[PDB]
Scaffold this motif. Structure first.
Motif, PDB file in Angstrom:
ATOM      1  N   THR A   1       0.823  -1.206   0.000  1.00  0.00           N
ATOM      2  CA  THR A   1       0.000   0.000   0.000  1.00  0.00           C
ATOM      3  C   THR A   1       0.858   1.258   0.000  1.00  0.00           C
ATOM      4  O   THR A   1       0.601   2.193  -0.766  1.00  0.00           O
ATOM      5  CB  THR A   1      -0.938  -0.003   1.204  1.00  0.00           C
ATOM      6  OG1 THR A   1      -1.577  -1.281   1.307  1.00  0.00           O
ATOM      7  CG2 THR A   1      -1.991   1.084   1.062  1.00  0.00           C
ATOM      8  N   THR A   2       1.885   1.297   0.851  1.00  0.00           N
ATOM      9  CA  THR A   2       2.794   2.438   0.850  1.00  0.00           C
ATOM     10  C   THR A   2       3.570   2.527  -0.457  1.00  0.00           C
ATOM     11  O   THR A   2       3.885   3.631  -0.916  1.00  0.00           O
ATOM     12  CB  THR A   2       3.758   2.346   2.032  1.00  0.00           C
ATOM     13  OG1 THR A   2       4.411   1.070   2.020  1.00  0.00           O
ATOM     14  CG2 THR A   2       3.006   2.512   3.345  1.00  0.00           C
TER      15      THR A   2
ATOM     16  N   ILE B   1       2.430   1.644  -3.497  1.00  0.00           N
ATOM     17  CA  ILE B   1       1.528   2.297  -4.424  1.00  0.00           C
ATOM     18  C   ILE B   1       1.422   3.750  -4.041  1.00  0.00           C
ATOM     19  O   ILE B   1       1.186   4.623  -4.851  1.00  0.00           O
ATOM     20  CB  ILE B   1       0.160   1.588  -4.447  1.00  0.00           C
ATOM     21  CG1 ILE B   1       0.368   0.119  -4.804  1.00  0.00           C
ATOM     22  CG2 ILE B   1      -0.782   2.249  -5.434  1.00  0.00           C
ATOM     23  CD1 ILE B   1       1.169  -0.090  -6.072  1.00  0.00           C
ATOM     24  N   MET B   2       1.665   4.032  -2.782  1.00  0.00           N
ATOM     25  CA  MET B   2       1.277   5.366  -2.361  1.00  0.00           C
ATOM     26  C   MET B   2       2.287   6.350  -2.819  1.00  0.00           C
ATOM     27  O   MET B   2       1.903   7.446  -3.286  1.00  0.00           O
ATOM     28  CB  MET B   2       0.696   5.542  -1.035  1.00  0.00           C
ATOM     29  CG  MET B   2       0.468   7.140  -0.775  1.00  0.00           C
ATOM     30  SD  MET B   2       1.663   7.499   0.000  1.00  0.00           S
ATOM     31  CE  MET B   2      -0.324   6.926   0.306  1.00  0.00           C
ATOM     32  N   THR B   3       3.502   5.963  -2.803  1.00  0.00           N
ATOM     33  CA  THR B   3       4.560   6.826  -3.287  1.00  0.00           C
ATOM     34  C   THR B   3       4.609   6.869  -4.808  1.00  0.00           C
ATOM     35  O   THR B   3       5.115   7.840  -5.371  1.00  0.00           O
ATOM     36  CB  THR B   3       5.850   6.347  -2.676  1.00  0.00           C
ATOM     37  OG1 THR B   3       6.789   7.409  -2.665  1.00  0.00           O
ATOM     38  CG2 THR B   3       6.384   5.139  -3.423  1.00  0.00           C
TER      39      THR B   3
ATOM     40  N   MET C   1       1.878   7.060  -6.658  1.00  0.00           N
ATOM     41  CA  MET C   1       0.935   8.149  -6.869  1.00  0.00           C
ATOM     42  C   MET C   1       1.534   9.479  -6.438  1.00  0.00           C
ATOM     43  O   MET C   1       1.375  10.494  -7.128  1.00  0.00           O
ATOM     44  CB  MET C   1      -0.372   7.853  -6.126  1.00  0.00           C
ATOM     45  CG  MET C   1      -1.186   9.069  -5.693  1.00  0.00           C
ATOM     46  SD  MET C   1      -0.654   9.847  -4.152  1.00  0.00           S
ATOM     47  CE  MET C   1      -1.565  11.385  -4.229  1.00  0.00           C
ATOM     48  N   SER C   2       2.235   9.495  -5.301  1.00  0.00           N
ATOM     49  CA  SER C   2       2.884  10.721  -4.850  1.00  0.00           C
ATOM     50  C   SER C   2       3.949  11.175  -5.839  1.00  0.00           C
ATOM     51  O   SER C   2       4.075  12.374  -6.116  1.00  0.00           O
ATOM     52  CB  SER C   2       3.492  10.518  -3.463  1.00  0.00           C
ATOM     53  OG  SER C   2       3.543  11.743  -2.750  1.00  0.00           O
TER      54      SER C   2
ATOM     55  N   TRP D   1      -1.857   4.721 -14.853  1.00  0.00           N
ATOM     56  CA  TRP D   1      -1.364   5.743 -13.941  1.00  0.00           C
ATOM     57  C   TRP D   1       0.024   6.249 -14.302  1.00  0.00           C
ATOM     58  O   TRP D   1       0.335   7.417 -14.042  1.00  0.00           O
ATOM     59  CB  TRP D   1      -1.355   5.217 -12.506  1.00  0.00           C
ATOM     60  CG  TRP D   1      -0.866   6.226 -11.524  1.00  0.00           C
ATOM     61  CD1 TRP D   1       0.343   6.235 -10.895  1.00  0.00           C
ATOM     62  CD2 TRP D   1      -1.564   7.391 -11.071  1.00  0.00           C
ATOM     63  NE1 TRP D   1       0.437   7.327 -10.069  1.00  0.00           N
ATOM     64  CE2 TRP D   1      -0.721   8.053 -10.159  1.00  0.00           C
ATOM     65  CE3 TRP D   1      -2.822   7.934 -11.343  1.00  0.00           C
ATOM     66  CZ2 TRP D   1      -1.095   9.233  -9.519  1.00  0.00           C
ATOM     67  CZ3 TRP D   1      -3.192   9.105 -10.706  1.00  0.00           C
ATOM     68  CH2 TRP D   1      -2.331   9.741  -9.805  1.00  0.00           C
TER      69      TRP D   1
END
Ligand SMILES: CCCCCCCCCCCCCCCCCC(=O)OC[C@H](COP(=O)([O-])OCC(O)COP(=O)([O-])OC[C@@H](COC(=O)CCCCCCCCCCCCCCCCC)OC(=O)CCCCCCCCCCCCCCCCC)OC(=O)CCCCCCCCCCCCCCCCC
Ligand SMILES: CCCCCCCCCCCCCCCCCC(=O)OC[C@H](COP(=O)([O-])OCC[N+](C)(C)C)OC(=O)CCCCCCCCCCCCCCCCC
Ligand SMILES: CCCCCCCCCCCCCCCCCC(=O)OC[C@H](COP(=O)([O-])OCC[N+](C)(C)C)OC(=O)CCCCCCCCCCCCCCCCC
Ligand SMILES: CCCCCCCCCCCCCCCCCC(=O)OC[C@H](COP(=O)(O)OCCN)OC(=O)CCCCCCCCCCCCCCCCC
Ligand SMILES: CCCCCCCCCCCCCCCCCC(=O)OC[C@H](COP(=O)(O)OCCN)OC(=O)CCCCCCCCCCCCCCCCC
Lengths: 83, 114, 175, 96, 11, 88, 293, 99, 98, 347, 70
Positions: free
Chosen positions: J7-8, J10-12, J14-15, J133
């Motif tokens: 999850t983290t 993917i999160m970066t 997107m970031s 993305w």
């Protein structure tokens, strides 16, 4: 009480290193905003004149700035003298 | 695309102060105190006009007062000046730390003589 | 003339790159790259880049390129190849010399060649200014402002490094 | 002990800086004359060397604006002994 | 050419 | 002038000594990457001695501490998920 | 005459590299009830000459499967490095007063790993390959503790200018403010440190490391007029450290690799971070930030 | 930016360093600070299409300061004729040029 | 634009060309990779120091510290492709024909 | 991968993409692309199969090469203007240099050979991330510098991408290859209009995006990796093939099925710019995408195919995935043609 | 006996001592009295160049005090 005291005893028995590093970092990151000297630290940092204090054009009514480095007007460095 | 105006050599003739750096730094503290107005107005020209060619006469005045500042200290206690700056010159960083007694032997004239 | 410090380090930098760009042995490519990294410091140092230059000697030379030596030593191909093993390596080596010979000789003769950019250029000693840094090293104050003016560049740089740790262990984990 | 000594050094540094501040303007005037003297000498040489050229009148303003561009190190000395260029350009960087 | 495997797996 | 002169004579005596010497008569790679990632973090926190004399020192303390906290977190993570422990 | 000053440093250091070996064997000797070299010359004074000229007369056999180019330049770098970091030492007045001397010392001392890495590869043997691999990973592991200790040490100094170290210490030895770091630093120095060369390369590193530790933690008073005071103090301090360096050479079983990495990454690195955190805020804590200029 | 979030919340993320005439540490100036100040101030509230042509001499002079191109060739042709003139003994440098 | 400025520029071009064609080795390919950033670090450094961009001196070190994230991930991929296939030889990367 | 780690991760990603769209400084742009690459690789290396290792290596090499090639272009811009802002670049060489670097990270021009293969080796779920993305950030930068773009270079990039997108997809059977070649062809469609209008590029972005998840996540629900494997879906899930066919029809761009909306507006906008041979050619070769679109549509729902005896087993059990966002993606990608004047919202 | 170590350490102590003494003495010599002026910043360097220029003999260490000015 019972859990924490045992846990620190559990930590500090087998290993003293990480609990030492956690402690030293703990004070090192909490104490910054406790003592009345970090304000002193930034004040002497601002006190150190690197560039020249370029003068201003005198046209009246600025009693703050002096007309001579010997004048009492302007900032006083005496606070650092005893510091 | 335009004349690059440059003052001639004749206007570029000042009574250049012939002193080393150590002697300059030794008397620098008292230099700034008693000769601020020449320097203060000259660098105001340098920062307001923002042009070296626009500030020449004030360049004459700062050196001239430097000579006027360097004459009395010759007339009164030239010898204490020598001992102070000959010990200042030794330091590779011109450290004021290892010059205290000689510093005291300097300013006690200007305290009472000048 | 020590004025040759102008081009001597820069042209050595070029031949250092052609040394490893021509794909020699990975150990030899490391040798070619660290040599170019070594002389590259000289150009920065001669420009005043003491702190930036020494960092290249620290993380690029003593860091990055050492771990390359670690990986290459681990690979340990049963028959390591030499700069003479393939004539293509020598062919590129002579080629890379020829282009830099053309550029340098064209530079020293006409000074007005038109490869890609306008080129031109005398000895580099000109482009320096005549100002003074006073008492503050202009470079040191620039990087010291990392914690003062760059409190956002640090976050993204720091966060990626930690994420750099998590990815490295995630793909080398081996399941 | 380090606390007391370090503040003493800071008091020493500002005093050293005070000397530099009180003594800076003389060099500003001195450096002002030096570069303008060096520029005037360069233009005077230019008014002796270059006549046969079709249209290269002396003292052309490379910059359109009538300001004072800080003289770049090249045309400052330029036509001097190669030792002078080496000492002036690298100098400080090499003095170690 | 051969079609890919169905599960993509190839001291 | 002075610097490379010292370097030049240093290797030259190294050259003359060796010349007369031979003429007269997964785990290993893993931490090596972690060292690399750590070493690049070292370079980020190197300019601190000059940064200690800024005028915005209040934002320096949080930021400079942030690296060391975050750098330690990478060590703490690497330790916990096996990893930093000497692999086989 | 500046060139003469270089020979007035390189050779005596080279002799200094030559002559503490008899100190080592006799200290290591007298430690184990033994005597050390004492039959060749008075008290082994001529023992270093007894080995060196023998070594240069010994033929330097070269492995059949050895790359000659790397096999001869790796010692070239090894000696070139070992006699280069002696140049910026603030011993009375340094030969080179580089404003970034500490960085230069670290970058060029971290370059020594290439020599051992090349020696193992060029030798091309199963022993040499692992031994180079073990030595380099042990070494490349330990600059991160080296760099942090030196970085965190220098917060209370003022800059990386090695000459400024003397002014910082002056009143007290700098160990009294960072003695947890001194043991942190000293231990890390132990592990970081043709065949005739390799004696010289690592060995100057041994003395210079202790010379580097001497100025860093146990400073002296440099009188501006008389410099001999700092000379004697610097030599005496770096001798006591080196004797300690060999005091521990024959006093502990040698480390094993898994502990060697475990000792740093699990018991040295995290504590080094905390001390760095302690020494980055404490100058701010007490408003005792030092002057760089 | 494609999404000027920093404009909305009004916090500086990357505008401190985007140009050389910003609040530099200890007020150490950029080499072409004076020329950049004129170019930026000329080309404000005008738009890319209009400002690229209108404030042209500002950009060209600033580019020349930034790159040191045209006046460098002025110096290049200064030395070009000099080597092509003193070599055959047409003129000799004065004492101050010699040193 | 001085002679040296484009001595780095071609060095980047030579490094780019070296990476843009593989001879036989992925490590050698990687060597041209961070070689390109070395010139990129180098080229930026002359610009910032020459122009006295007092605040842009940030950019070089972070240019290196972020090119490392590529490099660190770079070999770590190769160690994977050189333990299943055994050899870092890049002609063994054609298993994705279809 | 531990879900918290994933999850983290993917999160970066997107970031990293988000940082690109919100950064004025050129250097921060390269940082966002750097972080995006730094965490894209582990997502591809989640299954840990040799094809994934092959694909990740190809993706990393081409993306890292373009990343530092991008960095070189910024420096030249700094070399010639001393700027760092994204307004309009000041060096023609840097214009092409970064256009090449930006474009390679989208895989449209000859710089596209990675795209079919990188999505092939990696899993289907991570493929959705790669082709949806990872295609906003480079497009975001291109829209910002659309003023200074070179039309001659850029449109040559568009023509080749559409031509290769259709031609490549005709010969592929692995439906992952079908999607990538279709994606490349769509990329050429959007990429052609940046010199003329950035707004039409955005609309082509959302429509193409929603369409890809609609097709990809429907493919996820069917759990198929080849055309033959997709054929059997009719027996188990007849409904899935029914919407999957209408998505394919829209993917071709047949009105009133939305997906013709971008092609229509793209033709109209270039026509206003006196460019009329250009719209015709891309529109004509857009039919090439339709052929393998119909071919995939033919052997999934239109004609039933020989199933397998064990397929009776699958009928008894039911899907466990909650197919989040699948339904509204189909409708939003198949019926929004009447709501075209929402173009003003993007401006 | 344990004191036989000292002849070993003494010579190398001299071997370590010579570099320090030689550097300090040559600094006093080539700079003629005053030690080698240290220029860690451009301010100190341009100070030195001013000293070399004002000396009139191209030797920075030559210093002209009150006897020079009129
Ligand atoms: C415009 C109009 C159209 C667009 C509209 C906007 C929505 C777009 C997306 C629609 C839904 C897509 C989707 O999920 O499809 C199914 C599809 C497959 O789902 P799946 O079968 O469950 O497999 C996914 C994982 O492999 C399953 O792995 P797992 O089993 O480990 O489960 C992990 C999963 C499930 O969640 C968790 O496990 C929870 C984790 C909790 C711990 C962390 C707490 C701290 C963070 C909290 C954040 C809140 O969480 C994640 O995958 C993490 C990423 C997603 C959420 C967090 C983001 C920010 C920080 O989703 C994905 O593959 C996810 C891809 C990443 C997100 C979508 C990217 C494509 C769209 C990009 C463009 C968007 C518009 C731009 C303009
Ligand atoms: C997360 C922890 C680190 C960020 C928050 C704490 C530091 C804030 C800070 O430095 O703000 C600087 C500035 C405000 O400046 P400031 O007023 O704190 O300090 C100004 C100092 N001078 C004048 C020298 C520039 O804010 C930001 O940069 C915010 C960036 C985003 C922070 C959150 C990211 C998530
Ligand atoms: C307000 C105060 C602020 C600061 C407070 C700081 C914290 C309090 C003090 C902490 C302890 C002292 C500082 C750190 C010391 C090392 C810590 C450590 O990890 O120790 C355990 C470490 C590791 O011990 P270990 O491996 O058995 O156990 C560690 C813990 N576990 C089991 C969990 C891993 O000890 C060693 O590494 C042993 C020594 C190795 C080297 C061999 C030679 C030793 C030579 C010793 C004599 C010479 C000394 C010279 C000193 C310098 C002279 C100039
Ligand atoms: C002041 C107020 C706070 C005081 C301290 C309170 C907290 C004490 C924590 C004690 C350590 C953590 C708990 C513990 O006992 O962990 C033991 C374990 C040992 O792991 P290992 O040696 O591998 O052995 C097991 C496997 N064989 O540990 C582990 O596996 C994990 C080890 C992680 C080490 C991380 C080190 C980071 C750097 C040092 C800390 C810096 C400061 C960080 C911020 C602190 C903020 C308070
Ligand atoms: C733009 C042009 C057209 C484009 C789209 C064309 C679509 C059709 C063609 C698609 C292409 C492929 C060919 C057809 C393949 C069909 C495959 C399929 O799945 O068929 C079988 C399937 C089984 O459905 P089943 O699960 O049994 O559910 C039935 C309802 N309970 O059947 C189904 O799943 C169909 C179920 C139909 C359910 C529809 C429900 C409609 C409800 C309407 C309510 C109206 C209320 C009005 C109120 C008025 C007052 C307000």
């Amino acid at each position: 009480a019972g859990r924490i005291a045992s846990f620190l005893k559990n930590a500090w028995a087998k290993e003293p290193v990480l609990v030492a590093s956690f402690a030293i970092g703990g004070l090192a990151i909490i104490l910054p905003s406790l003592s009345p000297y970090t304000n002193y630290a930034i004040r002497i940092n601002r006190a150190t004149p690197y560039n020249y204090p370029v003068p201003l054009r005198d046209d009246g009514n600025m009693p703050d700035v002096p007309s001579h480095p010997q004048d009492p007007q302007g900032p006083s460095l005496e606070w650092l003298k005893n510091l | 695309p335009g004349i690059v105006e440059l003052p001639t050599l004749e206007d570029l003739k000042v009574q250049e102060v012939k002193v080393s750096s150590s002697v300059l730094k030794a008397a620098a503290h008292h230099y700034g105190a008693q000769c601020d107005k020449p320097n203060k107005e000259f660098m105001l020209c340098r920062w307001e006009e923002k042009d070296p060619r626009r500030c020449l006469e004030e360049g004459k005045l700062v050196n001239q007062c430097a000579l006027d500042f360097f004459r009395q200290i010759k007339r009164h206690c030239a010898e204490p000046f020598t001992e102070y700056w000959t010990c200042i010159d030794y330091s590779g960083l011109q450290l004021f730390r290892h010059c205290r007694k000689q510093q005291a032997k300097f300013d006690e004239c200007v305290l009472d003589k000048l | 003339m020590t004025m040759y410090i102008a081009f001597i380090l820069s042209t050595i930098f070029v031949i250092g790159f052609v040394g490893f760009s021509s794909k020699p042995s990975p150990i030899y490519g490391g040798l070619g790259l660290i040599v170019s990294g070594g002389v590259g410091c000289g150009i920065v140092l001669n420009f005043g880049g003491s702190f930036l230059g020494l960092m290249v000697f620290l993380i690029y030379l003593g860091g990055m390129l050492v771990v390359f030596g670690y990986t290459t030593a681990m690979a340990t191909e049963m028959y390591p190849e030499v700069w003479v093993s393939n004539k293509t390596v020598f062919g590129a080596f002579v080629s890379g010399l020829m282009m830099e010979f053309c550029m340098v000789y064209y530079a020293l003769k006409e000074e007005e060649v038109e490869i890609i950019f306008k080129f031109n250029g005398l000895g580099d000693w000109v482009i320096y200014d005549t100002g003074d840094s006073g008492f503050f090293s202009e470079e040191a104050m620039g990087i010291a402002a990392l914690y003062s003016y760059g409190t956002w560049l640090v976050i993204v740089t720091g966060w990626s490094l930690l994420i750099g740790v998590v990815v490295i262990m995630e793909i080398t984990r081996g399941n | 002990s380090m606390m007391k000594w370090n503040r003493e050094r800071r008091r020493l540094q500002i005093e050293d800086f005070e000397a530099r501040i009180a003594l800076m303007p003389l060099f500003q005037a001195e450096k002002d004359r030096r570069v303008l003297q060096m520029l005037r000498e360069n233009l005077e040489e230019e008014a002796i060397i270059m006549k046969d050229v079709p249209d290269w009148k002396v003292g052309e303003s490379v910059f359109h604006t009538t300001r004072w561009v800080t003289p770049m190190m090249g045309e400052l000395y330029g036509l001097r002994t190669n030792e002078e260029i080496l000492s002036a350009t690298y100098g400080f960087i090499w003095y170690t | 050419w051969k079609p890919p495997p169905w599960n993509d797996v190839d001291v | 002038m002075n610097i490379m002169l010292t370097l030049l004579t240093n290797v030259t005596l190294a050259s003359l000594l060796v010349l007369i010497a031979f003429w007269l008569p997964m785990k290993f790679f893993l931490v090596a990457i972690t060292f690399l990632l750590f070493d690049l973090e070292i370079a980020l926190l190197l300019p601190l001695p000059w940064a200690s004399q800024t005028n915005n020192l209040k934002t320096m303390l949080t930021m400079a501490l942030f690296l060391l906290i975050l750098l330690a977190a990478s060590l703490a993570y690497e330790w916990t998920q096996k990893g930093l422990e000497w692999a086989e | 005459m500046f060139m003469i000053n270089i020979l007035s440093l390189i050779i005596p250091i080279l002799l200094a590299v030559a002559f503490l070996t008899l100190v080592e064997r006799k200290v290591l000797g007298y430690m184990q009830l033994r005597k050390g070299p004492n039959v060749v010359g008075p008290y082994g004074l001529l023992q270093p000459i007894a080995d060196a000229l023998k070594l240069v007369t010994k033929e330097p056999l070269r492995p059949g499967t050895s790359s000659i180019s790397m096999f001869i330049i790796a010692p070239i770098l090894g000696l070139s490095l070992a006699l280069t970091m002696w140049v910026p030492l603030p011993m009375p007045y340094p030969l080179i007063n580089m404003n970034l001397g500490v960085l230069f010392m670290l970058a060029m001392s971290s370059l020594a790993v290439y020599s051992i890495l090349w020696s193992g590869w060029a030798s091309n043997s199963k022993y040499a390959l692992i031994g180079a691999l073990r030595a380099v990973a042990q070494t490349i592991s330990y600059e991160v503790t080296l760099a942090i200790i030196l970085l965190s040490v220098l917060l209370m100094n003022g800059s990386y200018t090695l000459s400024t170290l003397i002014t910082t210490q002056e009143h007290i030895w700098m160990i009294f403010t960072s003695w947890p770091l001194a043991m942190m630093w000293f231990i890390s120095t132990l592990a970081e440190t043709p065949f005739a060369m390799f004696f010289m390369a690592e060995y100057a590193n041994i003395i210079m490391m202790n010379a580097f530790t001497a100025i860093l933690f146990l400073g002296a008073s440099h009188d501006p007029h008389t410099p001999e005071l700092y000379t004697i103090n610097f030599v005496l301090k770096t001798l006591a450290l080196t004797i300690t360096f060999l005091w521990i050479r024959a006093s502990y079983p040698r480390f094993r690799y898994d502990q060697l990495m475990h000792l740093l990454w699990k018991s040295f690195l995290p504590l080094t971070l905390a001390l760095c955190m302690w020494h980055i805020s404490l100058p701010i804590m007490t408003a005792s930030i030092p002057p760089q200029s | 930016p494609f999404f000027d979030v920093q404009k909305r919340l009004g916090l500086d993320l990357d505008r401190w360093m985007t140009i050389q005439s910003a609040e530099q540490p200890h007020k150490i100036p950029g080499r072409c600070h004076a020329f950049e100040k004129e170019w930026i101030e000329c080309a404000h509230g005008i738009g890319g299409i209009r400002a690229e042509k209108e404030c042209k001499i500002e950009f060209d002079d600033f580019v020349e300061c930034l790159l040191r191109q045209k006046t460098m060739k002025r110096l290049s042709a200064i030395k070009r004729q000099r080597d092509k003139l003193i070599k055959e003994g047409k003129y000799t440098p004065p004492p101050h040029h010699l040193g | 634009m001085p002679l040296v400025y484009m001595n780095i520029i071609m060095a980047f071009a030579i490094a780019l060309a070296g990476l843009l064609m593989y001879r036989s080795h992925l490590m050698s390919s990687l060597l041209c990779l961070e070689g390109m950033m070395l010139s990129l670090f180098i080229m930026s450094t002359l610009i910032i120091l020459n122009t006295h961009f007092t605040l842009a001196n940030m950019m070089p070190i972070i240019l290196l510290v972020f090119a490392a994230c590529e490099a660190a991930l770079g070999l770590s991929l190769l160690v994977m492709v050189s333990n299943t296939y055994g050899t870092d030889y890049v002609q063994n990367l054609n298993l994705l024909q279809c | 991968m531990n879900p918290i780690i994933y999850t983290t991760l993917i999160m970066t990603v997107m970031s990293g993409t988000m940082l690109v769209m919100i950064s004025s400084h050129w250097l921060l742009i390269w940082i966002g692309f750097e972080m995006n690459l730094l965490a894209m690789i582990p997502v591809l290396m989640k299954n840990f199969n040799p094809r994934a290792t092959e694909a990740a290596t190809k993706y990393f090499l081409t993306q890292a090469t373009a990343s530092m090639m991008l960095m070189m272009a910024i420096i030249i811009n700094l070399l010639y203007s001393g700027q760092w802002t994204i307004t309009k670049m000041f060096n023609p060489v840097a214009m092409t240099m970064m256009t090449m670097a930006l474009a390679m990270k989208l895989g449209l021009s000859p710089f596209h050979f990675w795209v079919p293969e990188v999505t092939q080796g990696i899993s289907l779920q991570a493929g959705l991330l790669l082709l949806t993305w990872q295609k906003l950030a480079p497009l975001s930068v291109l829209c910002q510098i659309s003023q200074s773009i070179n039309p001659n270079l850029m449109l040559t990039m568009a023509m080749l991408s559409i031509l290769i997108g259709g031609w490549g997809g005709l010969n592929q059977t692995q439906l992952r290859k079908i999607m990538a070649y279709s994606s490349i062809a769509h990329m050429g469609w959007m990429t052609a209009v940046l010199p003329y209008n950035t707004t039409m590029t955005i609309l082509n972005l959302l429509i193409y995006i929603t369409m890809t998840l609609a097709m990809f996540m429907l493919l996820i629900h069917s759990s198929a990796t080849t055309t033959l494997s997709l054929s059997h879906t009719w027996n188990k899930m007849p409904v899935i093939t029914s919407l999957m066919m209408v998505t394919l029809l829209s993917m071709g761009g047949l009105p009133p099925l939305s997906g013709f909306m971008p092609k229509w507006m793209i033709i109209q906008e270039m026509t206003k710019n006196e460019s009329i041979i250009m719209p015709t050619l891309m529109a004509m070769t857009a039919l090439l995408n339709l052929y393998f679109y119909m071919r995939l549509a033919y052997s999934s729902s239109l004609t039933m195919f020989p199933s397998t005896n064990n397929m009776k087993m699958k009928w008894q059990f039911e899907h466990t995935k909650q197919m989040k966002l699948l339904p509204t993606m189909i409708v939003l990608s198949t019926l929004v043609l009447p709501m075209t004047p929402a173009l003003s919202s993007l401006n | 006996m344990w004191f036989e170590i000292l002849p070993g350490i003494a010579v190398m102590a001299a071997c370590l001592f010579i570099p320090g003494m030689a550097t300090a003495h040559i600094h006093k010599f080539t700079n003629g009295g005053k030690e080698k002026r240290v220029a860690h910043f451009s301010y100190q360097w341009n100070l030195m160049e001013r000293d070399r220029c004002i000396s009139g003999v191209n030797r920075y260490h030559v210093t002209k005090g009150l006897e020079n000015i009129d």
